[PDB]
Design a protein around this ligand. Sequence first.
Ligand code: DND
Ligand code: DND
Ligand code: FMN
Ligand code: FMN
Lengths: 216, 216
Amino acid sequence: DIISVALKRHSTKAFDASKKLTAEEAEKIKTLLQYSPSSTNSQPWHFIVASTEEGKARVAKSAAGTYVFNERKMLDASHVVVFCAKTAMDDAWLERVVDQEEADGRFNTPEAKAANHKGRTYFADMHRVDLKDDDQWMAKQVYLNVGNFLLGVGAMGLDAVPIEGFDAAILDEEFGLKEKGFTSLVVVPVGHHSVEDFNATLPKSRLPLSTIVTEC
Amino acid sequence: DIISVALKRHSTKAFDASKKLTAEEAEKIKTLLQYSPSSTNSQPWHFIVASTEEGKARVAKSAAGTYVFNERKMLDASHVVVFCAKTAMDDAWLERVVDQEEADGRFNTPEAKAANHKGRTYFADMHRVDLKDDDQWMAKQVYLNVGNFLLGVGAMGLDAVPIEGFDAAILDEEFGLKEKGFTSLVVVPVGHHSVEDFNATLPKSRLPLSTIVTEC
Ligand SMILES: Nc1ncnc2c1ncn2[C@@H]1O[C@H](COP(=O)(O)OP(=O)(O)OC[C@H]2O[C@@H]([n+]3cccc(C(=O)O)c3)[C@H](O)[C@@H]2O)[C@@H](O)[C@H]1O
Ligand SMILES: Nc1ncnc2c1ncn2[C@@H]1O[C@H](COP(=O)(O)OP(=O)(O)OC[C@H]2O[C@@H]([n+]3cccc(C(=O)O)c3)[C@H](O)[C@@H]2O)[C@@H](O)[C@H]1O
Ligand SMILES: Cc1cc2nc3c(=O)[nH]c(=O)nc-3n(C[C@H](O)[C@H](O)[C@H](O)COP(=O)(O)O)c2cc1C
Ligand SMILES: Cc1cc2nc3c(=O)[nH]c(=O)nc-3n(C[C@H](O)[C@H](O)[C@H](O)COP(=O)(O)O)c2cc1C
């Protein structure tokens, strides 16, 4: 009942620092990150998975000052995932993706690999050259991954919260992401809620279907 | 198991037009679109759900010509969902969201509404005034919804494919989206794959964890 999951999951506001993911749950949440779809299977992303106390403290440095309300969440969760996008799409990455597809057996003929390569490069160059928005295009693929991830961990029975309330410049510098060609977009602490998670008992709220949906 | 769903779902390349969603599935997918999370619960989206022959043909107009390889997906699927983002974030929309949250009982005191209203608007003007990218910020919330949606319909046993290969200017004009304040971002046909779906029997391909994940 994935609809029941969607109506029961929520953004956790406080995590129990004594409750850790199992070894199997930790493997599964990385599978979720890995197997998210993306346009042209571009996978323009990298993920920092912080589970040690020092690692999470490094992530939490980005939630200082104006974002202090998000700091404890990053310190208290079991596993803290930093979602990162590539800052520029390059031909080396397009080759890495198509060569991984080739090794995985997705091309039955050389014609199929050449068409998959040409099609992906044509669409990536539309963003790289024509629209000059490949950084935005790739970041959108990362947000799609986040949405897949939040529903996935909810269906696993894990608590989580997506966070944009952090200083991405501080987080990027903390993990040297700019020199690697990545930038942090969303931080998602994952674990089990604590008694201070006031959002666990509040009702959900969405705009009504009469507003957001047009049936045609 | 939701990890089984993630490992088994695929982008459907051909649909069986005779396999419709059930009435119950058609109601579930609307709740699935509605209850996706979004930054500050901004819900900056609208969805066209085309299920009639005329409606699906109208959406398919956006795939004529250069994007013709996506046209039959839009025509043959049971239901076709058009994900749209608001073109600009306005104060009236933010008040609509907070009014809905209050009506649903999320605020215990008046000091809980205003701190929520000003917390949403302080972060809203971060993209409206400072970073001048609220259109991009809203689009990213819509992509997050798409990711929630593809895992969701996959958990329901339904087939789907997310489509960026369409002409948004044609789709926007066909549904008058600009005048309503929205623009089309992703088309997702939903239904059941046919035997012509060559991607149903291809192995999935993802970059390895040693590339995309840094544990700390
Ligand atoms: N792995 C594979 N192994 C074997 N054949 C493969 C194949 N991938 C495609 N094909 C071949 O492709 C043909 C149909 O192409 P199909 O996969 O439906 O679609 P495709 O040609 O890749 O894309 C259709 C349109 O959407 C655009 N677009 C935009 C964004 C993302 C993507 C995307 O694909 O992620 C595409 C693209 O620029 C183009 O204008 C078939 O004849 C099939 O044989
Ligand atoms: N519905 C509610 N009913 C009762 N109390 C409610 C409440 N909502 C917040 N509160 C109160 O707020 C406090 C906890 O704050 P908390 O919810 O953790 O956090 P919040 O105030 O929503 O935001 C924390 C930081 O993240 C930033 N941010 C950025 C982007 C998106 C979002 C977002 O929220 O989507 C936030 C925001 O600008 C701020 O710097 C407690 O004092 C709690 O009582
Ligand atoms: C991209 C994104 C960023 C968010 N940022 C924050 C945040 O910084 N801190 C926070 O406590 N909640 C944050 N939220 C949680 C939203 O307020 C929440 O998703 C929304 O109110 C809907 O509630 P729900 O997640 O319980 O269904 C964010 C959500 C998203 C999707
Ligand atoms: C935003 C987005 C746009 C996509 N556009 C297309 C498209 O236009 N036509 C298509 O057939 N597939 C499209 N795809 C499918 C991707 O090729 C597919 O998600 C990726 O190769 C991973 O495979 P999977 O979805 O089977 O796991 C798109 C996927 C995403 C997420």
